[PDB]
């Protein structure tokens, strides 16, 4: 008799306070790390290896994402009361940066695979295309993030505060369903496959080697892969759960809706940490960058 | 570039640039190694596939679709401080030591701690196992190494010599790859290939920032 | 409130309702928030119910407004 | 035994006379000149195309054409105005340490570690560059080839000797001996009858090309001399050693006139060159930059910098319009 | 005994040289460096109209 | 010995096709840009076609543009010229000339022996004042020709070339920019000029020096020759 009743979306102010503090801290930390790595790379042009180019581009993407972070923090503070133009611009920049960062991680893994597995062969001559690869990555990321710019606008509701949502028609729910495939296909599955293949074969090659410093290389490779998984897997997992829920494969209750709604932003907060963890993981973990920073300190 | 002759000169310059780039591309397949060691240590008789080609002597044997160029600096008889920097970019140093005959240790100490080769790995070859094993029975390994205390067997004496040769390393970012060779040995090319590929792996690891 | 993934306000439909018991009625037209149009009636006892927009009388009163 | 004491008293007499001739230092007499201020040079051209370390470079007499040898085995002749590669000569041996350009522009010699001074002919009827001669007879690595004419060339070797050749016959016409160490660099006087060689025994001695006699010897450096250049009027020369110091010796006075040491300098000098007037003494160091020394007050009148690796060669055009530097990063930069 | 005989003769050759006071030599060097000072494109920057580079 | 010999000439009917082959032996063929220059009977030289080194840049005269085809065979050391349709104005003696371009090169030094072809029945204008000059040995002779534009380029190099054709022989280069003496010619020659007016002087003329003197401009294609001044004795 009581089966039919509206769902009441719940929220708490403690969650809002927590998300704003976490966002501010992540913004500051990622900005600091990206600034340091950019300065270290760009100060002296002695030995501009391909890894330097990759780290510079990755730091640029991370820093621009940090720039787009505080406006999203304000959005979580009170919804999108800032206008449609800022919605479009911020969403486009954020999506471009997310795609470019993930694809740059994939390209770095490809470089490492071609540098340690195919090291003796002449295939190592093919990693000189870093400028072209980076330009292609930025362009492709912009191409996939263009639908966000085209079809995003402020959406009003009687019970829901305004938020920078998408407006594609009266049946948007399923159009968003179709849109969500792109970030899960060219944003997590392909980069995960590339990283897994490249780093697995690199680990196999190192394992059959006889140098004295193989242990640190294996530790760093495993740390990179494990941290990428820890950072991005829960986000895609909750998105897949929501995907199954909206198609009614998984049974729908107000409690499940609330649980997924909270888990979504929690997982997003966790995954944002890629912007603050990338420098220490990729650049500052090597002796070259620490030495460069120390000499720059003079 | 406005004139016709200047256009033709620019075309000639572009053709020369293309030829230079192609020659440089063809000049990256080879591996440049340096040979060193005392005289009569077998420093010119490592691999039977010699194919050579007073001054500098080059040996360009190939293996596994990879070209190895061994520059034997012997015969110069000059001050090494003035031309040894010509070999800063060698992949490795092949050091040949004859166990059947202190000078070799002196060269090794000089070449290992040189400021140009602080990061260049060394492949150490200990030649003439049979001669050393036959000589140790006649004369114990005490005339040249009075500090020796261990057993007079072949294995322990060889390990002791290897230990004193490795003790002069005294440097990070460097590995010494050891191998024991006789006159009737043919797999020296394979050992050189493994050492060179290991060195290349380590250099690429350092460049990529993994360690 | 605050939401990042707006969803339909109504899950299931009830076709058993007395007009007198309904105190207030609201309608949400189809849009980016939800695909299906929802009509909600607030009972005088505080209970809230969902109605079928395809119902004949419900469709008539919907087209009336 | 008696000869040793005779040599000792001879050296004592020479030193006593040399000290007697000295009254005031150069830095004291010329203290009243206005300083040249700060001399800022900007990179006008950057010559690329080399794929390995560059050890030597020489300027054409017309101050427009260059020449450079590197580890890649290539000998490239540049057009210093429009940055064009006029010629590309492939060497037989990749180990080359000393370019030389003929005064008339017809020939270019290029020898090195392979013990012979290969001489190349540029103006041929067949349109290609052929090795006209290959001069042999040295037992050590070659350094600082210099052309006297189109058929007379002076060479320096690690055999502690310098030689004067005849390109036509190909035989060692005259041999200069007296050094006790590897001879690293030489420069020919503008009068083209004397030349000075800098050896590894921390001493540079003046030679005569006609008689083959050591007219003079100069001491004072604490390490091996690495480069030498004559003063424009042919009456002084500047030497550069690994002691991180440059000195100015005068042929008439037989003494060093002043020193060009700075407290911040640690690495030695690789190449030394003058300006057309003889006021700027440009020197290349191992710390990747060149310092311009005002040759009369020993003050650094600017710094070139700009290079990523060790500067191995310097060159000042005949008219003084430009200074070109070559380093180990396979890049040549022209300054003005 | 036959190797040091030429060294002392070289010392005889080097000892007898007509030496000149360093003051006069320094003055001559200064005079040259001041006389040929207007023709140096490095000491004094050349106008941009006459700079081929 | 540098030698350019070409064959393929002969009597052809109008509308036919003929190919001429210029075989080279004695120099690095792959490094020389090659031309084709034709001389009509008792009329004068005229530029036809040019192919650069490596067959990169190819030009044609406006008279035969789109009608002739030039090809280069670097391994074989052979230079070709394919002509589709031949009029009665194509009958001439065809010369093969090598040209190497860089800073300070001589780009018209060697000329082919010439092949005779018979057919049965904007631009810079260079003008030579006089067509025939009689003179006795030992007397200096002055030859001058003007140009429409000013050949003095912005880089200071003036592109004017002076050629000498002895009777029954092939033209030889004497001066290639303004006074730059060619390789092997006597030093008595001297050239001058300023912008558009140029002069050639021969001090102490010899009996072997008679012939027709052609002045050609190389500032911009198509290359144009002068009318031709003939020395008489």
F103/D65 Cβ within 8 A: yes
User: In a mutagenesis test of the A interface, which of B62, B174, B209 is the best target, namely the one with the most A β-carbons within 10 Å?
Assistant: B209
**Residue for token digits 């050609």?**
F216
Instruction: Give the helix, strand, coil percentages of chain F, each rounded to 5.
Output: 5, 45, 50
Q: Do chains E and F touch (3 or more CB pairs under 8 A)?
A: no
- Residue D132 near residue D121, CB atoms below 8 Å: yes
CB–CB of B79/B85 below 8 Å? no
The closest alpha carbon to A120, from B60, B197, B90, B24, belongs to B197
Classify strands F11-12 and F115-119 as parallel, antiparallel or unpaired.
parallel
Cβ(F6)–Cβ(F23) under 8 Å? yes
Distance CA B207, CA F90 (A): 67
Of A286, A294, A52, the closest CA to residue B206 belongs to: A286
CA distance F124 to chain B (A): 14
B3:F107 CB<8 A: no
Beginning with the edge strand found earlier in the chain, give each strand of the sheet holding D203-208 in spatial order: D183-188, D194-199, D203-208, D214-219
Match 């040979």 to its residue by tokens. Answer: B35
DSSP letters spanning D133-198: EEE---SS-EEEEEEEETTEEEEEESSSEEEEEETTT-SEEEEEE--SS-EEEEEE-TTSSEEEEE
Mutate to test the interface with F, among D86, D106, D125, D127 (most CBs of F within 10 A): D127
Which two tokens mark A40?
A: 């270290």
- Tell whether C60 is covered by a domain: yes
Query: Hey, of F101, F160, F221, which one would you mutate to test binding to chain B, going by the most B CBs within 10 A of its CB?
Result: F101
B7 CB within 8 Å of a chain A CB:
no
3-state secondary structure of D280: strand
3-state secondary structure of E10: helix
Among C24, C26, C32, pick the best mutation site for testing chain A contact (most A Cβ within 10 A). Answer: C32
Instruction: Output the CATH code of domain A13-296.
Output: 1.20.1070.10
- Please tell me what resolution, in angstroms, this structure has: 3.2
For residue B124, give the H/E element and its range.
Answer: strand B122-127
Cβ pair E8, D7 in contact under 8 A: yes
Q: What are the structure tokens assigned to F45, written together?
A: 């030289």
CATH number for the domain including C56? 2.40.50.40
Contact F45, F37 (CB under 8 A): yes
Contact residues, chain D to chain F, C-beta under 8 Å: 64-65, 79, 84, 86-87, 105, 123, 125-128
**How far apart (Å, rounded) are the C-alpha atoms in residues E35 and C11?**
101
CB E20 within 8 A of CB D23: no
> How far is it, in rounded angstroms, from Cα A139 to Cα A132?
10
- Two tokens at F157? 């190099």
Alpha carbon distance D149, D134 (integer Å):
17
- Backbone dihedral region for residue C25 (phi beyond 0: left; psi -120 to 50: alpha; all else: beta): beta
Query: Is B207 at the interface with chain A, CB within 8 A?
Result: yes
Q: Which domains does chain E have, with CATH numbers?
A: 1-53 (4.10.260.10)
Q: How far is CA D268 from CA A137, D58, D155, D275, D312, in A?
A: 47, 21, 23, 21, 11
Those of residues 212-241 in D touching chain E at CB distance below 8 A are 213-217, 231-233, 235-236
**Which residues fall within 8 angstroms of residue D20, CB to CB, at 6 or more apart?**
none
- Residue F30 burial class via C-beta count within 10 angstroms: exposed 0-12, middle 13-18, buried 19 and up: middle
Split into its structural domains, chain C has a count of: 1
From first CA to last CA, the distance across chain C in angstroms is: 28
Q: Which DSSP symbol is given to F220? A: S
Q: C-alpha angle with apex D149: D147 to D151, nearest 5 degrees?
A: 95
Look at F28 and D65 and tell me if their CB atoms are within 8 Å: no
Q: In whole angstroms, how large is the CA radius of gyration of chain D?
A: 20
Question: Which stretch of DSSP H or E encloses residue A134?
Answer: helix A130-150
Chain D contacts of E33, Cβ < 8 Å? 277-279, 295-296
- Which residues in chain D have Cβ-Cβ distances shorter than 8 Å to B12? 84-85
The CA–CA distances, whole Å, from F113 to D171, F70, F228 equal 42, 19, 19
Q: How far apart are CA A266 and CA F202, in angstroms?
A: 97
Please tell me whether residue F84 adopts helix, strand or coil conformation.
Answer: coil
Chain B residues with CB inside 8 Å of A206's CB? Answer: 201
Method: cryo-EM
Per-residue b/e over E25-40, b at no fewer than 16 CB within 10 Å? bbebbbebbeebeeeb
Q: How many CB pairs under 8 A join D and F?
A: 26
B23 in contact with chain D, both atoms CB, cutoff 8 A = yes
In a domain, C53, yes or no: yes
In angstroms, the separation between the Cα of residue E41 and the nearest Cα of chain D is 5
What the block records as the tokens of D89 is: 């000569």
Chain D: list its partners (3+ Cβ pairs within 8 Å).
B, E, F
* Chain A adjacent subunits, 3+ CB pairs under 8 A: B, C
Which has the closest alpha carbon to A101: A280, A279, A288, A275?
A: A275
For B1, which residue in chain F has the nearest alpha carbon?
A: F155
Chain breaks in chain F (C to N over 2.5 A) after: 121
The structure tokens listed for E8 are 């002392």
Could you tell me whether strands B92-98 and B122-127 are parallel, antiparallel, or unpaired per DSSP bridges? parallel
**Superfamily of domain D1-336 in the CATH hierarchy:** YVTN repeat-like/Quinoprotein amine dehydrogenase (2.130.10.10)
Q: Which of D18, D296, D320 minimises the CB distance to E30?
A: D296
Contact D79 F28 (CB under 8 A): no
Give D88's strand partners: D76
Name the region of B171 (left: φ>0; alpha: ψ -120 to 50; beta: rest).
beta
CA atoms of F130 and B38, how far apart (whole Å): 83
Residue A184 φ/ψ region, left for φ over 0, alpha for ψ in the -120 to 50 degree band, beta for the rest = alpha
Q: Kindly report the nearest CA distance between residue F1 and chain B, in angstroms.
A: 25
Helix (H) or strand (E) holding F187: none
Interface residues on D facing B, Cβ-Cβ cutoff 8 A: 49, 51-53, 71-72, 74, 79, 82, 84-86, 88, 93, 95, 97, 113-115, 139-141, 158, 181-182, 184, 200, 224
Contact indicator for E40, D275 with CB cutoff of 8 Å: yes
Question: At a CB cut-off of 8 Å and minimum separation 6, what does B13 contact?
Answer: D84, D85, D86
**SS3 (DSSP) at B173:** coil
Peptide bond into F222 cis (omega under 30): yes
| Burial label, D180 (beta-carbon count in 10 A; 0-12, 13-18, 19+) | exposed
Distance CA D260, CA F73 (A): 61
The answer to whether A203 and A218 are in contact (CB under 8 A) is yes
Nearest residue of F to residue B16, measured between CA atoms: F31
Instruction: Tell if the CB–CB gap between A174 and C35 is shorter than 8 Å.
Output: yes
As a whole number of Å, the CA-based R_g of chain E is 22
Residue A140 phi, psi (nearest 5): -65, -40
Q: Give the pair of three-digit tokens for residue F168.
A: 């029954």
Interchain proximity B210–A221, CB inside 8 Å: yes
Q: Is B142 on the interface with D (CB under 8 A)?
A: no
- How many whole angstroms from its chain centre is CA D22? 28
Total Cβ atoms within 10 A of residue A279:
25
Q: How far apart are CA D96 and CA D88, in angstroms?
A: 15
Give Cα D232 to chain centroid, integer Å.
13
CA–CA separation, D71 vs D69, rounded Å?
7
**Which segments within chain A are labelled E, that is strand?**
153-155, 163-165
Give the long-range contacts of residues F176-179, CB within 8 A, separation 24 or more. F176/F106, F176/F107, F176/F108
| Strand, coil or helix: B45 | coil
| Residue B25 contacts A where some CB pair is shorter than 8 Å | yes
Helix (H, G, I), strand (E, B) or coil at F79: strand
Strand partners, F93: F39, F116
**How crowded is the C-beta side of B86, counted as CA atoms within 13 Å?**
25
Decide: helix, strand or coil at residue B131. Answer: helix
**Alpha-carbon gap: F105 to the closest alpha carbon of chain B (Å):** 10
Of all residues in chain D, the one with the smallest CA distance to E19 is D253
**Domain spans of chain D, in order of start:** 1-336
Does any CB of chain F come closer than 8 Å to the CB of residue B54?
no
CA–CA dist A49, A127 (Å, integer) = 11
CA distance D50 to D69: 9
According to DSSP, residue F55 is labeled G
Backbone phi, then psi, for D158, in 5-degree steps?
Answer: -80, 0
A137 three-state secondary structure: helix
How do beta strands C38-43 and C22-28 pair? antiparallel
Cβ–Cβ contact C9 with A under 8 A: yes
Q: Write the CB contacts of D229 (distance below 8 Å, at least 6 apart in sequence).
A: D187, D237, D238, D272, D273, D274
Which residues fall within 8 angstroms of residue F131, CB to CB, at 6 or more apart? F227, F228, F229, F230
* D86 chain-B contacts, CB cut-off 8 A: 13
Backbone angles phi, psi at A190, to 5 degrees: -60, -50
Q: Is the backbone peptide bond immediately before D71 cis, with ω within 30 degrees of 0? A: no
Contact C40 A11 (CB under 8 A): no
DSSP string, D250-318: ETTT-SEEEE---TT--S-EEEEE--SSS-EEEEEESSS-EEEEETTT--EEEE----SS-EEEEEE-T
Give the domain ranges of chain A: 13-296
The closest CB to that of C35, out of A3, A173, A261, belongs to A173
- D280-285 and D290-294 beta bridge pairing: antiparallel
- Please count the other Cβ atoms lying within 10 Å of the Cβ belonging to residue A275: 27
Task: Please name each of the domains of chain F with its CATH number.
Answer: 3-119 (2.60.40.10), 126-232 (2.60.40.10)
CA-to-CA dists, residue D301 to A134, D37, D41, D293, D323, angstroms:
43, 6, 11, 6, 15
Helices (H), chain D: 2-21, 26-29
Is residue F47 within 8 Å of F70, Cβ to Cβ?
Answer: no
End-to-end, the C-alpha distance of chain A in Å comes to 77
Element (H, E) at D129: none
Inter-residue contact D197 to D162 (CB < 8 Å): yes
Sign of CA dihedral A229, A235, A238, A240: negative
Helices (H), B27-179: 103-112, 129-138, 154-166
B196: CB partners within 8 A, 6+ apart: A120, B31, B33, B66, B68, B91, B92
Residue D140 Cα, gap to closest chain E Cα (Å): 22
> What are A53's two structure tokens?
């180019």
Q: Beta partners for D248?
A: D238, D258
Distance CA C18, CA C15 (A): 10
Class of domain B30-205: alpha beta
If we measure between CA atoms, which residue out of D212, D257, D215 comes closest to residue D236? D257
CB contact residues (below 8 A), chain C span 17-46, against chain A = 26, 28, 30-35, 40
Tell me which chain D residues have a C-beta less than 8 angstroms from the C-beta of E51: 321, 336
Contact (CB, 8 A) for F37 and F115:
no
Q: How far apart are CA D318 and CA D335, in angstroms?
A: 14
Residue of chain D with shortest Cα separation from E9: D7
- Name the H helices within C10-65: 56-64
For residue C7, the chain A residue with the least C-alpha distance is A173
The whole-angstrom separation of Cα D313 and Cα D285 is 10
Query: Would residue C30 count as lying in a domain?
Result: yes
User: Is C39 contained in some domain?
Assistant: yes
Whose tokens are 């080697």? That residue is: A209
Structure-token pair, residue C6: 């707006």
**Residue A20 in tokens:** 């704003």
Which residue from B minimizes the CA distance to A54? B208
Q: What whole-number distance in Å separates Cα of residue D184 and Cα of residue D142? A: 8
E45 token code pair? 């920057």
Helix H or strand E encompassing F193? strand F189-194
Distance from CA of C27 to the nearest CA of A (A): 11
Chain B (124-183) residues lying within 8 Å, Cβ to Cβ, of chain A: 175, 177
- Cβ contacts of A166 on chain C, cutoff 8 Å: 32
By residue count, chain B amounts to 211
DSSP, residue by residue, A5-52: --------HHHHHHHHHHHHHHHHHHHHHHHHHHHHHHH--SS--HHH
For residue D23, give the H/E element and its range.
none
Subunit contact D88:B82, Cβ cutoff 8 A: no
Q: How far is the C-alpha of B155 from the C-alpha of B151, rounded, in Å?
A: 9
Q: 């210099």: which residue's tokens?
A: D146
Breaks in chain D (C to N > 2.5 A) come right after: none
Element (H, E) at A65: helix A50-78
Inter-residue contact C52 to C32 (CB < 8 Å):
no
Distance from CA of E26 to the nearest CA of D (A): 6
Residues of D with CB below 8 A from F31's CB? Answer: 127-128
**Closest by alpha carbon to B7, among F55, F28, F219?**
F219
Q: Whose structure tokens read 């002796």?
A: A287
């Amino acid at each position: 008799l009581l089966d039919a009743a509206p769902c009441e979306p719940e929220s708490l102010e403690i969650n809002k306070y927590f998300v704003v503090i976490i966002y501010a801290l992540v913004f500051l930390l990622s900005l600091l790390g990206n600034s340091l790595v950019m300065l270290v790379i760009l100060y002296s042009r002695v030995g501009r290896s391909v890894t330097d180019v990759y780290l510079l581009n990755l730091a640029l993407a991370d820093l621009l994402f940090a720039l787009t972070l505080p406006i999203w923090a304000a959005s979580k503070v009170n919804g999108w009361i800032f206008g449609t133009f800022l919605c479009k611009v911020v969403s486009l920049l954020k999506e471009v940066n997310f795609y470019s960062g993930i694809l740059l991680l994939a390209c770095i893994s490809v470089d490492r695979y071609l540098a340690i597995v195919h090291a003796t062969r002449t295939l190592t001559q093919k990693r000189y295309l870093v400028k072209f690869i980076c330009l292609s990555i930025w362009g492709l990321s912009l191409l996939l993030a263009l639908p966000v710019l085209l079809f995003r606008r402020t959406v009003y509701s009687s019970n829901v505060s305004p938020a920078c949502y998408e407006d594609m028609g009266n049946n948007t729910a399923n159009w968003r369903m179709l849109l969500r495939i792109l970030p899960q296909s060219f944003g997590f599955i392909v980069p995960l496959l590339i990283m897994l293949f490249c780093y697995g074969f690199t680990l196999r090659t190192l394992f059959k080697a006889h140098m004295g410093q193989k242990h640190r290389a294996m530790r760093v490779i495993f740390a990179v892969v494990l941290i990428f998984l820890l950072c991005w897997l829960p986000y895609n997992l909750v998105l897949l759960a929501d995907t199954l829920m909206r198609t009614q494969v998984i049974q729908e209750t107000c409690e499940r809706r609330n649980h997924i709604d909270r888990a979504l932003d929690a997982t997003e907060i966790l995954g944002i940490l890629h912007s603050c963890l990338n420098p220490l993981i990729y650049a500052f973990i090597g002796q070259k960058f620490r030495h460069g920073l120390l000499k720059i300190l003079a | 570039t406005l004139s016709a002759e200047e256009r033709a000169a620019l075309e000639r310059s572009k053709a020369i640039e293309k030829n230079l780039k192609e020659d440089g591309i063809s000049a990256a397949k080879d591996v440049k190694l340096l040979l060193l060691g005392a005289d009569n240590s077998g420093k010119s008789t490592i691999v039977k596939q010699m194919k050579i080609i007073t001054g500098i002597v080059e040996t360009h044997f190939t293996f596994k679709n990879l070209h190895f160029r061994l520059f034997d600096v012997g015969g110069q008889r000059s001050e090494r401080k003035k031309w040894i920097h010509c070999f800063e970019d060698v992949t490795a140093i092949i050091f040949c030591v004859d166990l059947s005959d202190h000078e070799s240790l002196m060269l090794f100490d000089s070449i290992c701690n040189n400021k140009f080769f602080i990061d260049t790995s060394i492949i150490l070859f200990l030649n003439k196992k049979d001669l050393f094993g036959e000589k140790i029975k006649k004369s114990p390994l005490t005339i040249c190494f009075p500090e020796y205390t261990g057993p007079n067997t072949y294995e322990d004496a060889a390990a002791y010599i290897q230990a004193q040769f490795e003790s002069k390393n005294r440097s990070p970012n460097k590995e010494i790859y050891c191998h024991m060779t006789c006159a009737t040995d043919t797999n020296n090319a394979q050992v050189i290939f493994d050492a060179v590929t290991d060195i290349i792996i380590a250099n690429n690891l350092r460049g990529c920032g993994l360690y | 409130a605050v939401l990042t993934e707006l969803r339909c306000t109504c899950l299931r439909v009830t076709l058993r309702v007395n007009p007198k018991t309904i105190g207030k009625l609201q309608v949400f037209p189809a849009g980016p928030q939800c695909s299906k149009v929802e009509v909600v009636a607030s009972l005088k006892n505080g209970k809230q119910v969902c109605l079928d927009p395809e119902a004949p009388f419900l469709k008539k009163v919907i087209q009336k407004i | 035994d008696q000869l040793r004491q005779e040599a000792e008293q001879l050296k004592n007499q020479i030193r006593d006379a040399r000290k007697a001739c000295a009254d005031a230092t150069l830095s004291q007499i010329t203290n009243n000149i206005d300083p040249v201020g700060r001399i800022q040079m900007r990179t006008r051209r950057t010559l690329r195309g080399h794929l390995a370390k560059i050890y030597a470079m020489h300027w054409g007499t017309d101050s427009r054409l260059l020449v450079s040898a590197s580890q890649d085995g290539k000998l490239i002749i540049w057009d210093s105005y429009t940055t064009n590669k006029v010629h590309a000569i492939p060497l037989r041996s990749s180990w080359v340490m000393t370019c030389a350009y003929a005064p008339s522009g017809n020939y270019v010699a290029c020898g090195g570690l392979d013990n012979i001074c290969s001489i190349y002919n540029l103006k041929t009827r067949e349109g290609n560059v052929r090795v006209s001669r290959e001069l042999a007879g040295h037992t050590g690595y070659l350094s600082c080839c210099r052309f006297l004419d189109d058929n007379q060339i002076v060479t320096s070797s690690g055999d502690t000797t310098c030689a004067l050749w005849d390109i036509e016959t190909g035989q060692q016409t005259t041999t200069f001996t007296g050094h006790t160490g590897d001879v690293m660099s030489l420069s020919l006087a503008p009068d083209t009858r004397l030349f000075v060689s800098g050896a590894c025994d921390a001493s540079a001695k003046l030679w005569d090309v006609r008689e083959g006699m050591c007219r003079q010897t100069f001491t004072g450096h604490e390490s091996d001399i690495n480069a030498i250049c004559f003063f424009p009027n042919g009456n002084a020369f500047a030497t550069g050693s690994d002691d991180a110091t440059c000195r100015l010796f005068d042929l008439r006075a037989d003494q060093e006139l002043m020193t060009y040491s700075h407290d911040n300098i640690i690495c030695g000098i690789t190449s030394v060159s003058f300006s057309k007037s003889g006021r700027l003494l440009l020197a290349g160091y191992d710390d990747f930059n060149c310092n311009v020394w005002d040759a009369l007050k020993a003050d650094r009148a600017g710094v070139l910098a700009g290079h990523d690796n060790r500067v191995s060669c310097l060159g000042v055009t005949d008219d003084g319009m430009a200074v070109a530097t070559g380093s180990w990063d396979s890049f040549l930069k022209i300054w003005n | 005994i036959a190797q040091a005989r030429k060294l002392v003769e070289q010392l005889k050759m080097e000892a007898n040289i007509d030496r000149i006071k360093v003051s006069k030599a320094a003055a001559d060097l200064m005079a040259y460096c001041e006389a040929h000072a207007k023709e140096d494109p490095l000491l004094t920057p050349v106008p941009a109209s006459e700079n081929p580079f | 010995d540098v030698q350019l010999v070409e064959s393929g000439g002969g009597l052809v009917q109008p509308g036919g096709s003929r190919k001429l082959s210029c075989s080279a032996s004695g120099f690095a063929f792959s490094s020389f840009g090659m031309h084709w220059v034709r001389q009509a009977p008792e009329k004068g030289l005229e530029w036809v076609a040019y192919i650069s080194s490596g067959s990169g840049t190819i030009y044609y005269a406006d008279t035969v543009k789109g009608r002739f085809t030039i090809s280069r065979d670097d391994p074989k050391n052979t230079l070709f010229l394919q002509m589709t349709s031949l009029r009665s104005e194509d009958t001439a003696m065809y010369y093969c000339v090598r040209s190497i371009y860089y800073y300070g090169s001589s780009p018209f030094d060697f000329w082919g022996q010439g092949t005779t072809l018979t057919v049965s029945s904007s631009d810079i204008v260079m003008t030579q004042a006089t067509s025939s000059v009689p003179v006795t040995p030992g007397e200096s002779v002055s030859i001058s020709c003007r140009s429409s534009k000013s050949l003095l380029h912005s880089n200071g190099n003036t592109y004017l070339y002076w050629f000498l054709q002895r009777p029954g022989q092939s033209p030889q280069l004497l001066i290639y920019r303004m006074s730059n003496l060619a390789s092997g010619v006597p030093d008595r020659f001297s050239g001058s000029g300023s912008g558009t007016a140029f002069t050639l002087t021969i001090s102490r003329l010899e009996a072997e020096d008679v012939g027709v003197y052609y002045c050609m401009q190389h500032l911009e294609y198509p290359l144009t020759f002068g009318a031709g001044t003939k020395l008489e004795l």
